[PDB]
């Protein structure tokens, strides 16, 4: 209804307005400058009208922002821009021809206009990102991953050690390119002990400062809620004792793990003299057995997810299969909160009952990224980049099944107290309009406040911080959040494509979101979010694939929606849409995807040549040998 | 009906019997020994009970036959064996449980038993062939294709020639492995003129010998049927004049093509010092543009299909697309002879009307392999091996659509004068039983006679042969015929899998065919059919894929056939069949296909190492430089 949309918009507009007022005040307080301007502190550049921040955010043209923030950050930001490029002319046309027999054909023709425009834009965007990636990589600084290949599933041998097997194999098969190597160690027990020691120290800092202020009897009952019914009488000496005990265990574990042959995993990081050689090893079959001596480009050391290297290669299939089943149950049992939200989705009081399903769904999905990342870690991936791309994939599917599809179906089930989809989809546009205004418009405006790190920063200063420059530990803005950023905008791309020929009035909400998100994330990318790992936009092929899937879904749903007309006869027309769209995808896959999945030998050779000419005396071996050992071992 | 099957079998059994009597007599006549024992003449080994040939054919165990005949010939023969391994226990079970509620479940369970057995056997066969291939290649003699990579779509340059561009690119990107190269030339005009000259000479040989026997006026009216209404008064001097004219054109063309820069195609055969290097070049991305400087293993020179190298790389997509359309029309318009055959398919006279549809269909399909090969040449492939694999692919599809599916549908259309497929499939088993006995049992028995080369050989001796040792040209048995061999047995694999749980009595006909074909082809492979090119069984992944497709088709058709039972409720069971089957296929694809599609670097290195140790003074450059020039240029 217009009244519910009007009120929901008024609420979300004012909410966003208020968030921007609060933001304007908070960002001018020097005590939280390290929260709002975390980058520039991390980059060594800084030390010590409420919306003016919007036009300032638009300064720093791409080339500068790429060097400042990184390629992934810029490419991610361009997705919001992609959204505006795809849907602005769609929205204009849909309004122009659907908003004041032929209506039937008009819808079919529009499906062709929308698909073609979308494909055209995706093609050009794909080409552009591929070019940005190739230029970025060619101009990128030296890193050990450019010369290093991770070797998995080294076969066992009764006499030779993993190190001996790796060195021998590569000296023989990759002669005069093989430089050095580092064998993977199962240091997980040690790493876990070290993390616990750090947590114990935080308690020591908490209680020592709390005590110093309040010089009385310590009474912590271990958990308080359901802990050990004791007192932790000193609580400081208690944690000192726990630390002393773990410290001894850690020293023992270090001596054992580095002299324990069973800590050696049949894997190693192999380094080559040239990038050309690494490019060859990473792209070629090494032996007869396709599931032995497996090679791939090593993640950069800050991207290597060390825990996953202790998983025997051969059990990875099983872990993956178990997680596929778990994923099914994750989506399966989420129907309960969906049904709840759709039940809720049914004058200033009734319009709130209308409004709230937006929030309720946002809240139920709040911890989904955590679940998806955890299950993604169980499946072994060995890198942060890979883990985030997989979590984003699973989330996208979840949103398709549970946020879009199930909401429409459950909605219809409540409305009803054949092709019922014919009315279920257009009626639910009202729900989606409100939903977008809640996790979209209001969502993004709220995110600029950065309340979580704001609070954490201050609490750490109040209770754990001891001296100067440990403020560096208190300050951590996190990364861009590809895991939630992607899946959210992809839902909107789907909704846009699904409803553009159905309900044109959904699109202005989607467009405002993309515009707002662009300016807010553009702002945050410049000032906060130091990036955890640098992929050279290797996720783009997945972004592309998800939009193509959205096109196919919309094209198919339209067959359903227009499949009620007697003698519709749209079948020989509309079927061409998913066929042509897939053809387009395969074309683009073959033409642009290699930019992202294969490193051409010519680029490797030019890079190696120039690097050598510029730095003729590079001790590459010294540089690479101490990389990829383990964060635990210094 | 039993009477039509009985008579058709009696006809085909006696026909096969007679063919084997005729064969036994013909093979003992010394004047046609070069037809029946063509190999051994080609191998330099020979010079100058009617069924005893069957037990003799079973001598020469695989290892010997592989060296004698070749790997492809042996692997092909094993397909008939694969057939017997898959269907013998299927036939036993189907007879045991279907031939004297639960019938419904019995059929579902059998689908699972058949699929599993088939997949098990295919898995083991796949593994075995992969091992045979790897062993064969490792032990294979030196050939120039082991060191040579074909480079396509060399980009244009205003100043540098294709040769200069290729040499430079490879010296820079593949330094110290690049050995030499040979640029591709558009010698097609010349090659065509040379072939015409040879045809003109054959006429000169025909008329000179005919005249010498009959010393009178020559009266050939150019074609006779619709030629030039003249006499070719001398006919010998006439062809001498045509030869003299083309001879002059050829000399001119040779001088022009080797000094014509426009005859140079942007492609070259690039040779490397090592097999390891060729393996790298052939498996790696060379430049930024994925559709430039494209590399693949060069076909051996006797496999290179030179005509296809004159096609600009960039027009290949268009040629392919045109041929896909042509293929559609080829299958589309074949419905006319299908309908004819099915119309025909409706006491010794009525049983012949029953019998003849077998023959009629065989005859209409007789020239299909020619069509498919011609259209496959239009699409550029550059090798005989590739052309045959593509022709076999298209033929397989044709058989599925036109021989199997359309026959069942057209059959039902005539029978009828909903799920009618429920009865159309089992009723047509009678047709297929007869068809198999005609192009199968009788077909193979007839092929052992080799009537076409028998006749051609004798006619050439009678009219063209002039002296000794030109009998070598008269004798040519052709190759194995993968193009017709594959598609035929695949139809039978399909029919077997489709009808095993439906009509168990189709299977004994299929089994007899596989058994007969095995012994006949085993015999011919040993004695005739010198192989045109040696693939190291690289077609196996396609054989495998076709059987998997047949499993999926049978599994799906069964849903249809059992989908008439009210409350069948077979959907959550039967759907698992194509899902599990595809899963199996992907497993096998990932585990065994690399044996056929990637050459591992370790094997390349071991091969190069051993080769060098055995022959420490190999002038590899001299060896490789004169390869792949063109058959025309000496």
DSSP secondary structure string for all residues of A493-518? HHHHHHHTTT-GGGHHHHHHHHHHHH
Residues of A in contact with B605 (CB under 8 A): 172-173
Asked whether the beta carbons of A246 and A201 are under 8 A apart, the reply is: no
d(CA A528, CA A525): 6
According to CATH, what is the number of the domain B144-183+264-314? 3.30.70.330
DSSP A629: S
Strands A264-272 and A294-297: unpaired
Check A288 against B600: CB less than 8 A apart.
yes
Check B601 against A285: CB less than 8 A apart.
yes
Rounded to 10 deg, the angle between the A2-26 and A350-364 helix axes is 60
Structure tokens at A568: 């519709």
Asked whether the beta carbons of A498 and A557 are under 8 A apart, the reply is: yes
Q: In the A/B pair of chains, how many CB contacts fall below 8 A?
A: 79
d(CA B182, CA B145): 13
d(CA B223, CA A151): 70
Closest residue in A to B597 (Cα–Cα): A285
Q: Which long-range contacts (CB under 8 A, 24 or more apart) does A18-23 make?
A: A19/A442, A19/A445, A19/A446, A19/A448, A19/A449, A20/A50, A20/A51, A20/A445, A20/A448, A21/A50, A22/A449, A23/A50, A23/A53, A23/A448, A23/A449
**Chain B nearest C-alpha distance from A289 (Å):** 8
**Chain A nearest C-alpha distance from B569 (Å):** 21
d(CA A183, CA A268): 4
- Residues A101-131 as b or e (16 or more Cβ within 10 Å = b): eeeeeebbebbebbbebbbebbbebbeebbe
d(CA B219, CA B91): 64
Burial of B494 (0-12, 13-18, 19+ CB in 10 A): buried
Q: Quick one: CA dihedral B513, B519, B520, B524, positive or negative? A: positive
Q: Which residues contact residue B410 at a Cβ distance below 8 angstroms, ignoring those fewer than 6 apart?
A: B335, B338, B339, B342
Check B284 against A285: CB less than 8 A apart.
no
Cα-only R_g, chain A? 28
d(CA A63, CA A76): 15
**Chain A nearest C-alpha distance from B494 (Å):** 28
Q: Where are the domains of chain B?
A: 2-143+315-615, 144-183+264-314, 189-257
Structure tokens at A562: 């227009």
Check A288 against B601: CB less than 8 A apart.
no
Angle ∠(B461,B463,B465) on CA atoms, nearest 5: 50
**Residue for token digits 């008009």?**
A106
Helices (H), A416-539: 421-427, 429-436, 443-447, 451-463, 471-474, 482-499, 507-527
Give Cα A11 distance to the centre of its chain: 29
d(CA B501, CA B498): 7
Cα-only R_g, chain B? 28
**Conformational region of residue B513, where left means phi above 0, alpha means psi within -120 to 50, and beta covers everything else:** alpha
Q: Which residues contact residue A524 at a Cβ distance below 8 angstroms, ignoring those fewer than 6 apart?
A: A447, A448, A450
Check B603 against A134: CB less than 8 A apart.
no
Q: Which residues contact residue B236 at a Cβ distance below 8 angstroms, ignoring those fewer than 6 apart?
A: B204, B207, B208, B211, B218
3-class SS at A435? helix
Question: What is the length of chain B?
Answer: 634
**Conformational region of residue A295, where left means phi above 0, alpha means psi within -120 to 50, and beta covers everything else:** beta
Residues of A in contact with B591 (CB under 8 A): 290-291
Structure tokens at B290: 């994925």
Asked whether the beta carbons of A490 and A551 are under 8 A apart, the reply is: no
Closest residue in B to A605 (Cα–Cα): B173
3-class SS at B151? strand
d(CA B350, CA B285): 65
- Strands of the A178-185 sheet, one edge to the other: A178-185, A264-272, A148-152, A294-297
d(CA B557, CA B568): 15
Q: Does domain A148-180+264-304 have CATH number 3.30.70?
A: yes
Burial of B30 (0-12, 13-18, 19+ CB in 10 A): exposed
Helices (H), B437-506: 443-447, 451-463, 471-474, 482-499
The Cβ of residue B575 has, within 10 Å, a number of other Cβ atoms equal to: 13
d(CA B527, CA B37): 5
Asked whether the beta carbons of A40 and A46 are under 8 A apart, the reply is: yes
d(CA B599, CA A285): 7
Asked whether the beta carbons of A271 and A625 are under 8 A apart, the reply is: yes
d(CA A261, CA A253): 14
Q: Which of B286, B595, B602 is nearest residue A602 as measured by Cβ atoms?
A: B286
3-class SS at A181? strand
d(CA A396, CA A403): 10
Structure tokens at B130: 């992969």
Residues of B in contact with A174 (CB under 8 A): 601
The Cβ of residue A155 has, within 10 Å, a number of other Cβ atoms equal to: 12
φ, ψ dihedrals at B220, nearest 5°: -75, 120
Asked whether the beta carbons of A23 and A449 are under 8 A apart, the reply is: yes
Q: Which residues contact residue B283 at a Cβ distance below 8 angstroms, ignoring those fewer than 6 apart?
A: A283, A284, A285, B598, B599
d(CA A558, CA B61): 62
d(CA A210, CA A232): 14
Check A603 against B172: CB less than 8 A apart.
no
Closest residue in B to A276 (Cα–Cα): B173
Residues of B in contact with A591 (CB under 8 A): 290-291
d(CA B399, CA B411): 16
Closest residue in A to B130 (Cα–Cα): A288
**Chain B nearest C-alpha distance from A116 (Å):** 21
Check B594 against A283: CB less than 8 A apart.
no
Strands (DSSP E) along B79-210, which ranges? Answer: 148-152, 178-185
Determined by: cryo-EM
Chain A residues near any Cβ of chain B (below 8 Å):
134, 169, 172-174, 279-280, 283-288, 290-291, 293, 590-592, 594-595, 598-603, 605
d(CA A336, CA A340): 6
Q: Which of A172, A287, A605 is nearest residue B600 as measured by Cβ atoms?
A: A287
Closest residue in B to A606 (Cα–Cα): B173
Asked whether the beta carbons of A128 and A575 are under 8 A apart, the reply is: no
Q: Which of B174, B287, B601 is nearest residue A600 as measured by Cβ atoms?
A: B287
Q: Which of A284, A591, A600 is nearest residue B601 as measured by Cβ atoms?
A: A284
**Chain A nearest C-alpha distance from B599 (Å):** 7
Residues of A in contact with B600 (CB under 8 A): 284-288
Q: Which long-range contacts (CB under 8 A, 24 or more apart) does B563-566 make?
A: B563/B419, B563/B422, B564/B419, B564/B422, B565/B104
Check A284 against B287: CB less than 8 A apart.
no
Residues of B in contact with A599 (CB under 8 A): 285
Residues of A in contact with B602 (CB under 8 A): 169, 173, 286-288, 293
Check A173 against B602: CB less than 8 A apart.
yes
Closest residue in A to B176 (Cα–Cα): A176
Rounded to 10 deg, the angle between the B316-332 and B368-378 helix axes is 160
d(CA B479, CA B485): 11
Asked whether the beta carbons of A82 and A136 are under 8 A apart, the reply is: no
Query: For B591-608, what is the HEC assignment?
Result: HHCHHHHCCCHHHHHHHH
**Chain A nearest C-alpha distance from B285 (Å):** 5
Check B285 against A285: CB less than 8 A apart.
no
Give the closest residue to B16 by CA, choosing from B484, B491, B513, B511.
B513
The Cβ of residue A9 has, within 10 Å, a number of other Cβ atoms equal to: 17
Q: Which of A173, A592, A601 is nearest residue B605 as measured by Cβ atoms?
A: A173
Check A173 against B594: CB less than 8 A apart.
no
Resolution (A): 3.1
Longest dimension (CA), chain B: 86
Residues of B in contact with A173 (CB under 8 A): 601-602, 605
The Cβ of residue B158 has, within 10 Å, a number of other Cβ atoms equal to: 4
Residues of A in contact with B590 (CB under 8 A): 290
Check B285 against A595: CB less than 8 A apart.
no
Give the closest residue to B492 by CA, choosing from B443, B419, B422.
B443
Q: Quick one: CA dihedral B104, B105, B109, B110, positive or negative? A: negative
Torsion of CA B90, B96, B99, B104, to 10 degrees: -80
Q: Quick one: CA dihedral B147, B149, B155, B158, positive or negative? A: positive
d(CA A33, CA A218): 35
Cross-strand partners of A149: A270, A297
């Amino acid at each position: 209804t217009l009244q519910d949309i009007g009120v929901s918009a008024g609420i979300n507009i004012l909410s966003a307005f208020v968030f921007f007022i609060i933001f304007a005040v908070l960002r001018l307080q020097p005590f939280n400058d390290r929260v709002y301007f975390s980058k520039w502190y991390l980059k060594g550049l800084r030390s010590s009208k409420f919306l003016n921040w919007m036009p300032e955010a638009l300064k720093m043209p791409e080339p500068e922002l790429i060097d400042h923030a990184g390629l992934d950050s810029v490419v991610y930001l361009r997705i919001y821009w992609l959204g505006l490029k795809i849907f602005t002319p769609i929205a204009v046309l849909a309004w122009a021809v659907l908003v004041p027999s032929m209506r039937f054909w008009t819808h079919i023709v529009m499906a062709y206009a929308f698909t073609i425009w979308t494909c055209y834009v995706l093609m050009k965007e794909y080409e552009t990102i591929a070019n940005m990636r190739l230029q970025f990589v060619a101009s990128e600084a030296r890193r050990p991953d450019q010369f290093t290949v991770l070797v998995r599933n080294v076969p066992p041998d009764a006499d030779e050690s993993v190190s001996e097997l790796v060195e021998h194999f590569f000296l023989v098969n990759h002669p005069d390119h093989y430089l050095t190597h580092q064998v993977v160690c199962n240091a997980n027990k040690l790493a876990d002990l070290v993390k616990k020691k750090k947590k114990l120290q935080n308690w020591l800092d908490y209680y020592q400062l709390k005590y110093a202020r309040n010089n009385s009897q310590r009474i912590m009952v271990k958990l308080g809620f359901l802990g050990l019914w004791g007192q932790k009488v000193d609580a400081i000496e208690h944690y000192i004792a726990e630390i002393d005990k773990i410290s001894k265990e850690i020293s023992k574990e270090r001596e054992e793990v580095v002299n324990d042959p069973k800590a050696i995993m049949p894997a190693a990081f192999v380094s080559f003299k040239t990038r050309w050689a690494a490019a060859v090893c990473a792209q070629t079959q090494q032996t007869r057995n396709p599931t032995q001596w497996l090679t791939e480009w090593a993640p950069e050391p800050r991207d290597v997810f060390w825990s996953n290297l202790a998983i025997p290669y051969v059990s990875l299939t099983v872990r993956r299969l178990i997680m596929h089943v778990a994923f099914f149950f994750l989506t399966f049992f989420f129907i309960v909160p969906i049904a709840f939200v759709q039940s809720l989705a049914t004058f200033m009081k009734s319009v709130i009952q209308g409004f709230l399903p937006g929030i309720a769904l946002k809240l139920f999905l709040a911890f989904l990224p955590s679940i998806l990342m955890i299950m993604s870690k169980f499946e072994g991936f060995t890198s942060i980049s890979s883990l985030e791309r997989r979590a984003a994939f699973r989330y996208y599917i979840f949103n398709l099944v549970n946020v879009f599809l199930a909401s429409v179906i459950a909605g219809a089930a409540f409305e009803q107290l054949p092709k019922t989809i014919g009315v279920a989809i257009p009626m639910k546009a009202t729900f989606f309009i409100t939903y977008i205004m809640v996790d979209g418009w209001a969502g993004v405006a709220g995110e600029i406040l950065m309340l979580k790190p704001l609070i954490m920063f201050h609490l750490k200063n109040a209770f754990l911080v001891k001296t100067d420059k440990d403020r560096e530990e208190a300050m951590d803005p996190g990364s861009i959040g590809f895991n939630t950023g992607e899946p959210r905008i992809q839902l909107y791309f789907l909704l846009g494509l699904v409803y553009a020929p159905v309900t044109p009035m959904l699109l202005p909400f989607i467009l405002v979101f993309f515009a707002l998100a662009y300016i807010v994330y553009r702002h945050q990318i410049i000032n906060v979010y130091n990036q955890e790992y640098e992929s050279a936009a290797a996720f783009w092929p997945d972004v592309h694939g998800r939009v193509i899937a959205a096109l196919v879904i919309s094209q198919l749903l339209l067959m359903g929606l227009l499949g009620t007309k007697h003698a519709a006869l749209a079948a020989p027309f509309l079927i061409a849409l998913p066929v042509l769209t897939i053809g387009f995808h395969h074309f683009c896959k073959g033409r642009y995807e290699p930019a992202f999945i294969r490193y051409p030998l010519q680029e490797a050779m030019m890079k190696d040549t120039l690097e050598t000419a510029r730095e003729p005396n590079l001790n590459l071996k010294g540089y690479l040998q101490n990389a990829y050992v383990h964060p635990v071992f210094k």
